[PDB]
């Protein structure tokens, strides 16, 4: 609706309060950090998509300083590039999940620098 | 409320902890390039994540430690290093830091060496236009960032990289490595300025490159496959680079000294190895964009930028004396050009040049017999223009084929429709090579082989063909490496040296994705026993030398001719060569 | 020592060898004596906490239909960096008629200075590309490219090479398989000048792979 | 006609063989024409007798044979503007195999240790 009046198009083939959006975003990040063998990759792609969409939708855009502290960001970075989760052909979540993580982080950074 | 400092801290922590093999290098570099590009690739884009000096050095040393670095990863590395040139440090420059350590030398040597142990298809080691453009952008950013501070270290770094790459067991010598990347870096090096660079590394690189190019020229191949850009352009560009290099004058203590009035042509003149190498390389090059033209230009500019004419006559007469001697068309023209002035002739006579010349004509006339066709060949040729000899001979193969190959031996078979093939061969799964042995009734001076595959469907054309010649017809013997002819409509294997051969074996390889061979016609071009450069290597060149000496300037022709007179048997030899048709 | 120092890499031949070397009773006794089983248990705990499941769950099944390797060339578009005499979209067909091969489906003319020509294929979305298929002209494959380099880009802007250009002179069918399937949205085929021909003739380009939910 | 069992009629000398071998190891960019010629000549050098150590032991003992074989099998070819496939062809491989087989035969009775 906002388009007729692209990075998340790989699935389909308004003004919001600041505090509750920040709380649900940081809880979504804590959900991301608590992803084990019970959780799956499609849930990861969809939570990344909804995280990027809520981050870009809220006015003003939520930045990462109020999203993650140093240990959470360090865990995310070692999750993205370290070979404790990116070893072999079974790298974290598969290439689709890595691409989705990259797109969500890129969207949040682009929202920060507007 | 910017999260930039904590992310910088986290990436520096990652860059320090990757040393224990806990982070993948390719994933780390790709992610840091993607997060730094959010402000389409461009060499002018400033990355948003500013890195650290220890992080950059650790990344560089772990890259230099890592062998079999793929070209995917190599282009990723080049883009990341371009970004490392784009950054600023928080007071020395980052480009000076990148250039100062030899780790950048090691990474660039691993990149341009083009080893690829992974390659089961080590076909052509070129890295492609995108990677060459990325490396060129990296070098251009290096010159821009080091032009204001210190171009000395950058020009010394480039000369050291080329010199170490061009030494024994190097990438230019062995021939491995991306040809496009090497020629793009060389043409990039052409535009650089070397006006403070040390004379020691300059001498090392010039000796190494002259040894490599002389070893390539004197020991060249016996065949050439005729079809662009090849390694001939690499030699042409290296000689152009050293043509630029020898024109640079040096000023000062002849050490860490160019300063845009002696020249380095004198420095390469003091080196006996280089003069012997370049004169020998001009000794076996043919006359009329080519290597001989390049060698003529580098020696011409060496003579032009040289101060004293004495240092011009000393290497020439030591090469002619130490060589019997090899005397070619460019060497004759250079000797005539360096003996243009009156002082040149006076200095040539003063240190005993003409008498040595006379001894050389006597020794060469006593040495070489005439190769010209005399009257005997004319008056016997008819008592019993390159012609074909395939119809005269017969053909055979080591394996029983479904049809004989004598149809290939016709002078001209009808090539208008090409229904199936003139001759076809079927391959067993175990075998890959099939040999066609053609026996001629007599040995002929073979010059060039012509192989025509099937023109309607050249999928059956052989992937590679090796030509082998035998003069006696029994001692089977190869000519050179099997040449790849896949995708070639016409196969022309010329010989630089015409060979007396009576039996010719064409060993054809299995095609790349076809089990059948289809051929149309085999030609055997050459001459029989009785069916410019050929006179220059004889004593005629030295006779031209005497004529130019005694006739260029008439004022010095007398006393020097009086020195040329009392040599033994001069007049008899002159009369005998005048009585000759030559 | 290899399993501990490796997290650890454990393959099918390694599993079979570990099962084979632990065949005897003394092997199990010696394995337990120097602390092997506890290290194994720690490895399962660390690996289970490490790797997330990659299997397709119910969400992909119940969203896949609300909106077996398939071709993706007809979906994308094609372009070239140089103005050709004809567009190359005929190469992008699912199956063009290959029965006579009159002249070529697509042809390219080479300038004397240039040797490489690039065909950039932009897909509407990034796909898990697995293998490239290039069919040259079948009636006269003298116009087949001497060598071809395949380059992939996931974002569609950061142009990026895959490997060394492979020599295809004398090849009727070009099959460039990938050991690692790559998420790519733009594919550049840089074709080299043939060995003794100034023209290129091609029939059909295929882009095989999967999607995120296919 | 060439054969690995043919005895050459000109018997050579030890100093001559060592000088030839060292000038071959000194010479770089040795072509494959010249390399197959070298292999046939070395096969003949295995075929000869000396006038009381064996000639095969003499050929094997010095590292010059290592240097010549390394230059042959390294397949450098700086001359090649068409460094396509460094294989030397079936005739040269058969000649080298015949040379190695003659080396094992001549050193089997005396000392296969050194071979």
JSON list of N, CA and C in Angstrom, two decimals, chain B residues 418-483:
[
{"chain": "B", "resi": 418, "resn": "UNK", "atom": "N", "xyz": [30.32, -31.80, -48.17]},
{"chain": "B", "resi": 418, "resn": "UNK", "atom": "CA", "xyz": [30.81, -32.41, -46.93]},
{"chain": "B", "resi": 418, "resn": "UNK", "atom": "C", "xyz": [29.68, -33.18, -46.23]},
{"chain": "B", "resi": 419, "resn": "UNK", "atom": "N", "xyz": [29.28, -34.27, -46.88]},
{"chain": "B", "resi": 419, "resn": "UNK", "atom": "CA", "xyz": [28.14, -35.08, -46.44]},
{"chain": "B", "resi": 419, "resn": "UNK", "atom": "C", "xyz": [28.33, -35.62, -45.03]},
{"chain": "B", "resi": 420, "resn": "UNK", "atom": "N", "xyz": [29.29, -36.52, -44.85]},
{"chain": "B", "resi": 420, "resn": "UNK", "atom": "CA", "xyz": [29.60, -37.05, -43.53]},
{"chain": "B", "resi": 420, "resn": "UNK", "atom": "C", "xyz": [31.02, -36.70, -43.10]},
{"chain": "B", "resi": 421, "resn": "UNK", "atom": "N", "xyz": [32.02, -37.13, -43.86]},
{"chain": "B", "resi": 421, "resn": "UNK", "atom": "CA", "xyz": [33.44, -36.85, -43.68]},
{"chain": "B", "resi": 421, "resn": "UNK", "atom": "C", "xyz": [34.17, -37.52, -44.84]},
{"chain": "B", "resi": 422, "resn": "UNK", "atom": "N", "xyz": [35.36, -37.01, -45.15]},
{"chain": "B", "resi": 422, "resn": "UNK", "atom": "CA", "xyz": [36.22, -37.73, -46.09]},
{"chain": "B", "resi": 422, "resn": "UNK", "atom": "C", "xyz": [36.85, -38.94, -45.42]},
{"chain": "B", "resi": 423, "resn": "UNK", "atom": "N", "xyz": [37.32, -38.78, -44.18]},
{"chain": "B", "resi": 423, "resn": "UNK", "atom": "CA", "xyz": [37.82, -39.90, -43.39]},
{"chain": "B", "resi": 423, "resn": "UNK", "atom": "C", "xyz": [37.31, -39.77, -41.97]},
{"chain": "B", "resi": 424, "resn": "UNK", "atom": "N", "xyz": [36.97, -40.91, -41.36]},
{"chain": "B", "resi": 424, "resn": "UNK", "atom": "CA", "xyz": [36.44, -40.93, -40.00]},
{"chain": "B", "resi": 424, "resn": "UNK", "atom": "C", "xyz": [37.18, -41.98, -39.17]},
{"chain": "B", "resi": 425, "resn": "UNK", "atom": "N", "xyz": [37.31, -41.69, -37.88]},
{"chain": "B", "resi": 425, "resn": "UNK", "atom": "CA", "xyz": [37.97, -42.59, -36.94]},
{"chain": "B", "resi": 425, "resn": "UNK", "atom": "C", "xyz": [37.10, -42.76, -35.70]},
{"chain": "B", "resi": 426, "resn": "UNK", "atom": "N", "xyz": [37.01, -44.01, -35.23]},
{"chain": "B", "resi": 426, "resn": "UNK", "atom": "CA", "xyz": [36.23, -44.37, -34.04]},
{"chain": "B", "resi": 426, "resn": "UNK", "atom": "C", "xyz": [37.17, -44.70, -32.89]},
{"chain": "B", "resi": 427, "resn": "UNK", "atom": "N", "xyz": [36.89, -44.14, -31.72]},
{"chain": "B", "resi": 427, "resn": "UNK", "atom": "CA", "xyz": [37.76, -44.24, -30.55]},
{"chain": "B", "resi": 427, "resn": "UNK", "atom": "C", "xyz": [37.27, -45.30, -29.58]},
{"chain": "B", "resi": 428, "resn": "UNK", "atom": "N", "xyz": [38.19, -46.16, -29.16]},
{"chain": "B", "resi": 428, "resn": "UNK", "atom": "CA", "xyz": [37.94, -47.06, -28.05]},
{"chain": "B", "resi": 428, "resn": "UNK", "atom": "C", "xyz": [37.99, -46.27, -26.75]},
{"chain": "B", "resi": 429, "resn": "UNK", "atom": "N", "xyz": [37.28, -46.72, -25.71]},
{"chain": "B", "resi": 429, "resn": "UNK", "atom": "CA", "xyz": [37.30, -45.97, -24.44]},
{"chain": "B", "resi": 429, "resn": "UNK", "atom": "C", "xyz": [38.67, -45.88, -23.80]},
{"chain": "B", "resi": 430, "resn": "UNK", "atom": "N", "xyz": [39.52, -46.89, -23.98]},
{"chain": "B", "resi": 430, "resn": "UNK", "atom": "CA", "xyz": [40.83, -46.87, -23.33]},
{"chain": "B", "resi": 430, "resn": "UNK", "atom": "C", "xyz": [41.81, -45.94, -24.05]},
{"chain": "B", "resi": 431, "resn": "UNK", "atom": "N", "xyz": [41.73, -45.85, -25.37]},
{"chain": "B", "resi": 431, "resn": "UNK", "atom": "CA", "xyz": [42.68, -45.05, -26.14]},
{"chain": "B", "resi": 431, "resn": "UNK", "atom": "C", "xyz": [42.19, -43.62, -26.32]},
{"chain": "B", "resi": 432, "resn": "UNK", "atom": "N", "xyz": [43.15, -42.71, -26.51]},
{"chain": "B", "resi": 432, "resn": "UNK", "atom": "CA", "xyz": [42.84, -41.30, -26.68]},
{"chain": "B", "resi": 432, "resn": "UNK", "atom": "C", "xyz": [43.59, -40.72, -27.88]},
{"chain": "B", "resi": 433, "resn": "UNK", "atom": "N", "xyz": [44.71, -41.33, -28.23]},
{"chain": "B", "resi": 433, "resn": "UNK", "atom": "CA", "xyz": [45.54, -40.90, -29.35]},
{"chain": "B", "resi": 433, "resn": "UNK", "atom": "C", "xyz": [45.46, -41.93, -30.48]},
{"chain": "B", "resi": 434, "resn": "UNK", "atom": "N", "xyz": [45.35, -41.43, -31.71]},
{"chain": "B", "resi": 434, "resn": "UNK", "atom": "CA", "xyz": [45.49, -42.27, -32.89]},
{"chain": "B", "resi": 434, "resn": "UNK", "atom": "C", "xyz": [46.51, -41.66, -33.83]},
{"chain": "B", "resi": 435, "resn": "UNK", "atom": "N", "xyz": [47.38, -42.49, -34.40]},
{"chain": "B", "resi": 435, "resn": "UNK", "atom": "CA", "xyz": [48.50, -42.02, -35.20]},
{"chain": "B", "resi": 435, "resn": "UNK", "atom": "C", "xyz": [48.28, -42.32, -36.68]},
{"chain": "B", "resi": 436, "resn": "UNK", "atom": "N", "xyz": [48.44, -41.30, -37.51]},
{"chain": "B", "resi": 436, "resn": "UNK", "atom": "CA", "xyz": [48.45, -41.44, -38.96]},
{"chain": "B", "resi": 436, "resn": "UNK", "atom": "C", "xyz": [49.89, -41.26, -39.43]},
{"chain": "B", "resi": 437, "resn": "UNK", "atom": "N", "xyz": [50.51, -42.34, -39.87]},
{"chain": "B", "resi": 437, "resn": "UNK", "atom": "CA", "xyz": [51.89, -42.31, -40.35]},
{"chain": "B", "resi": 437, "resn": "UNK", "atom": "C", "xyz": [51.87, -42.23, -41.87]},
{"chain": "B", "resi": 438, "resn": "UNK", "atom": "N", "xyz": [52.48, -41.18, -42.42]},
{"chain": "B", "resi": 438, "resn": "UNK", "atom": "CA", "xyz": [52.55, -40.96, -43.85]},
{"chain": "B", "resi": 438, "resn": "UNK", "atom": "C", "xyz": [54.00, -41.16, -44.27]},
{"chain": "B", "resi": 439, "resn": "UNK", "atom": "N", "xyz": [54.22, -42.14, -45.14]},
{"chain": "B", "resi": 439, "resn": "UNK", "atom": "CA", "xyz": [55.55, -42.48, -45.63]},
{"chain": "B", "resi": 439, "resn": "UNK", "atom": "C", "xyz": [55.71, -41.95, -47.05]},
{"chain": "B", "resi": 440, "resn": "UNK", "atom": "N", "xyz": [56.65, -41.08, -47.24]},
{"chain": "B", "resi": 440, "resn": "UNK", "atom": "CA", "xyz": [56.94, -40.54, -48.56]},
{"chain": "B", "resi": 440, "resn": "UNK", "atom": "C", "xyz": [57.96, -41.41, -49.27]},
{"chain": "B", "resi": 441, "resn": "UNK", "atom": "N", "xyz": [57.93, -41.46, -50.60]},
{"chain": "B", "resi": 441, "resn": "UNK", "atom": "CA", "xyz": [58.95, -42.26, -51.31]},
{"chain": "B", "resi": 441, "resn": "UNK", "atom": "C", "xyz": [60.36, -41.75, -51.09]},
{"chain": "B", "resi": 442, "resn": "UNK", "atom": "N", "xyz": [60.52, -40.45, -50.85]},
{"chain": "B", "resi": 442, "resn": "UNK", "atom": "CA", "xyz": [61.82, -39.87, -50.56]},
{"chain": "B", "resi": 442, "resn": "UNK", "atom": "C", "xyz": [61.65, -38.77, -49.53]},
{"chain": "B", "resi": 443, "resn": "UNK", "atom": "N", "xyz": [62.74, -38.49, -48.81]},
{"chain": "B", "resi": 443, "resn": "UNK", "atom": "CA", "xyz": [62.74, -37.40, -47.85]},
{"chain": "B", "resi": 443, "resn": "UNK", "atom": "C", "xyz": [62.66, -36.06, -48.57]},
{"chain": "B", "resi": 444, "resn": "UNK", "atom": "N", "xyz": [61.83, -35.17, -48.05]},
{"chain": "B", "resi": 444, "resn": "UNK", "atom": "CA", "xyz": [61.63, -33.84, -48.62]},
{"chain": "B", "resi": 444, "resn": "UNK", "atom": "C", "xyz": [61.91, -32.81, -47.54]},
{"chain": "B", "resi": 445, "resn": "UNK", "atom": "N", "xyz": [62.20, -31.59, -47.98]},
{"chain": "B", "resi": 445, "resn": "UNK", "atom": "CA", "xyz": [62.38, -30.48, -47.05]},
{"chain": "B", "resi": 445, "resn": "UNK", "atom": "C", "xyz": [61.00, -29.96, -46.67]},
{"chain": "B", "resi": 446, "resn": "UNK", "atom": "N", "xyz": [60.42, -30.61, -45.66]},
{"chain": "B", "resi": 446, "resn": "UNK", "atom": "CA", "xyz": [59.12, -30.24, -45.14]},
{"chain": "B", "resi": 446, "resn": "UNK", "atom": "C", "xyz": [59.17, -28.87, -44.47]},
{"chain": "B", "resi": 447, "resn": "UNK", "atom": "N", "xyz": [58.11, -28.08, -44.68]},
{"chain": "B", "resi": 447, "resn": "UNK", "atom": "CA", "xyz": [58.09, -26.71, -44.16]},
{"chain": "B", "resi": 447, "resn": "UNK", "atom": "C", "xyz": [56.84, -26.44, -43.33]},
{"chain": "B", "resi": 448, "resn": "UNK", "atom": "N", "xyz": [55.71, -27.05, -43.68]},
{"chain": "B", "resi": 448, "resn": "UNK", "atom": "CA", "xyz": [54.46, -26.72, -43.03]},
{"chain": "B", "resi": 448, "resn": "UNK", "atom": "C", "xyz": [53.43, -27.81, -43.29]},
{"chain": "B", "resi": 449, "resn": "UNK", "atom": "N", "xyz": [52.67, -28.15, -42.25]},
{"chain": "B", "resi": 449, "resn": "UNK", "atom": "CA", "xyz": [51.62, -29.16, -42.33]},
{"chain": "B", "resi": 449, "resn": "UNK", "atom": "C", "xyz": [50.28, -28.45, -42.39]},
{"chain": "B", "resi": 450, "resn": "UNK", "atom": "N", "xyz": [49.39, -28.95, -43.24]},
{"chain": "B", "resi": 450, "resn": "UNK", "atom": "CA", "xyz": [48.02, -28.46, -43.35]},
{"chain": "B", "resi": 450, "resn": "UNK", "atom": "C", "xyz": [47.06, -29.59, -43.03]},
{"chain": "B", "resi": 451, "resn": "UNK", "atom": "N", "xyz": [46.21, -29.38, -42.03]},
{"chain": "B", "resi": 451, "resn": "UNK", "atom": "CA", "xyz": [45.19, -30.34, -41.64]},
{"chain": "B", "resi": 451, "resn": "UNK", "atom": "C", "xyz": [43.83, -29.68, -41.72]},
{"chain": "B", "resi": 452, "resn": "UNK", "atom": "N", "xyz": [42.96, -30.24, -42.55]},
{"chain": "B", "resi": 452, "resn": "UNK", "atom": "CA", "xyz": [41.60, -29.75, -42.69]},
{"chain": "B", "resi": 452, "resn": "UNK", "atom": "C", "xyz": [40.64, -30.74, -42.05]},
{"chain": "B", "resi": 453, "resn": "UNK", "atom": "N", "xyz": [39.96, -30.38, -40.97]},
{"chain": "B", "resi": 453, "resn": "UNK", "atom": "CA", "xyz": [38.95, -31.26, -40.37]},
{"chain": "B", "resi": 453, "resn": "UNK", "atom": "C", "xyz": [37.66, -31.21, -41.19]},
{"chain": "B", "resi": 454, "resn": "UNK", "atom": "N", "xyz": [36.64, -31.89, -40.68]},
{"chain": "B", "resi": 454, "resn": "UNK", "atom": "CA", "xyz": [35.34, -31.88, -41.34]},
{"chain": "B", "resi": 454, "resn": "UNK", "atom": "C", "xyz": [34.73, -30.49, -41.21]},
{"chain": "B", "resi": 455, "resn": "UNK", "atom": "N", "xyz": [34.33, -29.91, -42.35]},
{"chain": "B", "resi": 455, "resn": "UNK", "atom": "CA", "xyz": [33.83, -28.54, -42.38]},
{"chain": "B", "resi": 455, "resn": "UNK", "atom": "C", "xyz": [32.34, -28.44, -42.08]},
{"chain": "B", "resi": 456, "resn": "UNK", "atom": "N", "xyz": [31.56, -29.48, -42.37]},
{"chain": "B", "resi": 456, "resn": "UNK", "atom": "CA", "xyz": [30.13, -29.42, -42.06]},
{"chain": "B", "resi": 456, "resn": "UNK", "atom": "C", "xyz": [29.89, -29.57, -40.56]},
{"chain": "B", "resi": 457, "resn": "UNK", "atom": "N", "xyz": [30.62, -30.47, -39.91]},
{"chain": "B", "resi": 457, "resn": "UNK", "atom": "CA", "xyz": [30.48, -30.70, -38.47]},
{"chain": "B", "resi": 457, "resn": "UNK", "atom": "C", "xyz": [31.89, -30.90, -37.90]},
{"chain": "B", "resi": 458, "resn": "UNK", "atom": "N", "xyz": [32.49, -29.81, -37.42]},
{"chain": "B", "resi": 458, "resn": "UNK", "atom": "CA", "xyz": [33.83, -29.85, -36.87]},
{"chain": "B", "resi": 458, "resn": "UNK", "atom": "C", "xyz": [33.83, -30.17, -35.37]},
{"chain": "B", "resi": 459, "resn": "UNK", "atom": "N", "xyz": [32.70, -30.67, -34.85]},
{"chain": "B", "resi": 459, "resn": "UNK", "atom": "CA", "xyz": [32.70, -31.28, -33.53]},
{"chain": "B", "resi": 459, "resn": "UNK", "atom": "C", "xyz": [33.63, -32.49, -33.49]},
{"chain": "B", "resi": 460, "resn": "UNK", "atom": "N", "xyz": [33.84, -33.14, -34.63]},
{"chain": "B", "resi": 460, "resn": "UNK", "atom": "CA", "xyz": [34.73, -34.28, -34.75]},
{"chain": "B", "resi": 460, "resn": "UNK", "atom": "C", "xyz": [36.17, -33.86, -35.03]},
{"chain": "B", "resi": 461, "resn": "UNK", "atom": "N", "xyz": [36.45, -32.56, -35.04]},
{"chain": "B", "resi": 461, "resn": "UNK", "atom": "CA", "xyz": [37.82, -32.10, -35.18]},
{"chain": "B", "resi": 461, "resn": "UNK", "atom": "C", "xyz": [38.63, -32.52, -33.96]},
{"chain": "B", "resi": 462, "resn": "UNK", "atom": "N", "xyz": [39.89, -32.91, -34.15]},
{"chain": "B", "resi": 462, "resn": "UNK", "atom": "CA", "xyz": [40.69, -33.37, -33.01]},
{"chain": "B", "resi": 462, "resn": "UNK", "atom": "C", "xyz": [40.93, -32.25, -32.01]},
{"chain": "B", "resi": 463, "resn": "UNK", "atom": "N", "xyz": [40.91, -32.61, -30.73]},
{"chain": "B", "resi": 463, "resn": "UNK", "atom": "CA", "xyz": [41.17, -31.62, -29.69]},
{"chain": "B", "resi": 463, "resn": "UNK", "atom": "C", "xyz": [42.60, -31.12, -29.80]},
{"chain": "B", "resi": 464, "resn": "UNK", "atom": "N", "xyz": [43.55, -32.03, -30.02]},
{"chain": "B", "resi": 464, "resn": "UNK", "atom": "CA", "xyz": [44.93, -31.62, -30.20]},
{"chain": "B", "resi": 464, "resn": "UNK", "atom": "C", "xyz": [45.62, -32.59, -31.14]},
{"chain": "B", "resi": 465, "resn": "UNK", "atom": "N", "xyz": [46.62, -32.08, -31.85]},
{"chain": "B", "resi": 465, "resn": "UNK", "atom": "CA", "xyz": [47.36, -32.85, -32.84]},
{"chain": "B", "resi": 465, "resn": "UNK", "atom": "C", "xyz": [48.85, -32.61, -32.62]},
{"chain": "B", "resi": 466, "resn": "UNK", "atom": "N", "xyz": [49.64, -33.68, -32.64]},
{"chain": "B", "resi": 466, "resn": "UNK", "atom": "CA", "xyz": [51.09, -33.58, -32.57]},
{"chain": "B", "resi": 466, "resn": "UNK", "atom": "C", "xyz": [51.70, -34.04, -33.88]},
{"chain": "B", "resi": 467, "resn": "UNK", "atom": "N", "xyz": [52.61, -33.24, -34.42]},
{"chain": "B", "resi": 467, "resn": "UNK", "atom": "CA", "xyz": [53.27, -33.57, -35.68]},
{"chain": "B", "resi": 467, "resn": "UNK", "atom": "C", "xyz": [54.65, -34.09, -35.29]},
{"chain": "B", "resi": 468, "resn": "UNK", "atom": "N", "xyz": [55.02, -35.23, -35.86]},
{"chain": "B", "resi": 468, "resn": "UNK", "atom": "CA", "xyz": [56.31, -35.84, -35.64]},
{"chain": "B", "resi": 468, "resn": "UNK", "atom": "C", "xyz": [56.98, -36.15, -36.98]},
{"chain": "B", "resi": 469, "resn": "UNK", "atom": "N", "xyz": [58.28, -35.87, -37.10]},
{"chain": "B", "resi": 469, "resn": "UNK", "atom": "CA", "xyz": [58.99, -36.10, -38.36]},
{"chain": "B", "resi": 469, "resn": "UNK", "atom": "C", "xyz": [60.15, -37.07, -38.17]},
{"chain": "B", "resi": 470, "resn": "UNK", "atom": "N", "xyz": [60.45, -37.82, -39.24]},
{"chain": "B", "resi": 470, "resn": "UNK", "atom": "CA", "xyz": [61.57, -38.75, -39.24]},
{"chain": "B", "resi": 470, "resn": "UNK", "atom": "C", "xyz": [62.21, -38.72, -40.62]},
{"chain": "B", "resi": 471, "resn": "UNK", "atom": "N", "xyz": [63.52, -38.44, -40.66]},
{"chain": "B", "resi": 471, "resn": "UNK", "atom": "CA", "xyz": [64.24, -38.38, -41.93]},
{"chain": "B", "resi": 471, "resn": "UNK", "atom": "C", "xyz": [64.53, -39.75, -42.53]},
{"chain": "B", "resi": 472, "resn": "UNK", "atom": "N", "xyz": [64.94, -40.72, -41.72]},
{"chain": "B", "resi": 472, "resn": "UNK", "atom": "CA", "xyz": [65.24, -42.05, -42.24]},
{"chain": "B", "resi": 472, "resn": "UNK", "atom": "C", "xyz": [64.01, -42.93, -42.43]},
{"chain": "B", "resi": 473, "resn": "UNK", "atom": "N", "xyz": [62.87, -42.58, -41.85]},
{"chain": "B", "resi": 473, "resn": "UNK", "atom": "CA", "xyz": [61.65, -43.33, -42.03]},
{"chain": "B", "resi": 473, "resn": "UNK", "atom": "C", "xyz": [61.47, -44.45, -41.03]},
{"chain": "B", "resi": 474, "resn": "UNK", "atom": "N", "xyz": [62.47, -44.71, -40.18]},
{"chain": "B", "resi": 474, "resn": "UNK", "atom": "CA", "xyz": [62.43, -45.79, -39.21]},
{"chain": "B", "resi": 474, "resn": "UNK", "atom": "C", "xyz": [62.55, -45.26, -37.78]},
{"chain": "B", "resi": 475, "resn": "UNK", "atom": "N", "xyz": [63.38, -44.25, -37.56]},
{"chain": "B", "resi": 475, "resn": "UNK", "atom": "CA", "xyz": [63.66, -43.74, -36.22]},
{"chain": "B", "resi": 475, "resn": "UNK", "atom": "C", "xyz": [62.52, -42.76, -36.02]},
{"chain": "B", "resi": 476, "resn": "UNK", "atom": "N", "xyz": [61.46, -43.23, -35.38]},
{"chain": "B", "resi": 476, "resn": "UNK", "atom": "CA", "xyz": [60.27, -42.42, -35.20]},
{"chain": "B", "resi": 476, "resn": "UNK", "atom": "C", "xyz": [60.64, -41.30, -34.22]},
{"chain": "B", "resi": 477, "resn": "UNK", "atom": "N", "xyz": [60.29, -40.05, -34.53]},
{"chain": "B", "resi": 477, "resn": "UNK", "atom": "CA", "xyz": [60.78, -38.95, -33.65]},
{"chain": "B", "resi": 477, "resn": "UNK", "atom": "C", "xyz": [59.93, -37.68, -33.59]},
{"chain": "B", "resi": 478, "resn": "UNK", "atom": "N", "xyz": [59.50, -37.25, -32.41]},
{"chain": "B", "resi": 478, "resn": "UNK", "atom": "CA", "xyz": [58.57, -36.11, -32.33]},
{"chain": "B", "resi": 478, "resn": "UNK", "atom": "C", "xyz": [59.20, -34.76, -32.66]},
{"chain": "B", "resi": 479, "resn": "UNK", "atom": "N", "xyz": [58.36, -33.84, -33.15]},
{"chain": "B", "resi": 479, "resn": "UNK", "atom": "CA", "xyz": [58.77, -32.48, -33.50]},
{"chain": "B", "resi": 479, "resn": "UNK", "atom": "C", "xyz": [58.58, -31.48, -32.37]},
{"chain": "B", "resi": 480, "resn": "UNK", "atom": "N", "xyz": [57.39, -31.41, -31.79]},
{"chain": "B", "resi": 480, "resn": "UNK", "atom": "CA", "xyz": [57.14, -30.49, -30.69]},
{"chain": "B", "resi": 480, "resn": "UNK", "atom": "C", "xyz": [55.95, -30.98, -29.87]},
{"chain": "B", "resi": 481, "resn": "UNK", "atom": "N", "xyz": [55.46, -30.12, -28.98]},
{"chain": "B", "resi": 481, "resn": "UNK", "atom": "CA", "xyz": [54.29, -30.42, -28.17]},
{"chain": "B", "resi": 481, "resn": "UNK", "atom": "C", "xyz": [53.03, -30.50, -29.04]},
{"chain": "B", "resi": 482, "resn": "UNK", "atom": "N", "xyz": [52.08, -31.36, -28.68]},
{"chain": "B", "resi": 482, "resn": "UNK", "atom": "CA", "xyz": [50.85, -31.46, -29.47]},
{"chain": "B", "resi": 482, "resn": "UNK", "atom": "C", "xyz": [50.08, -30.16, -29.39]},
{"chain": "B", "resi": 483, "resn": "UNK", "atom": "N", "xyz": [49.75, -29.59, -30.53]},
{"chain": "B", "resi": 483, "resn": "UNK", "atom": "CA", "xyz": [49.06, -28.31, -30.57]},
{"chain": "B", "resi": 483, "resn": "UNK", "atom": "C", "xyz": [47.56, -28.53, -30.48]}
]
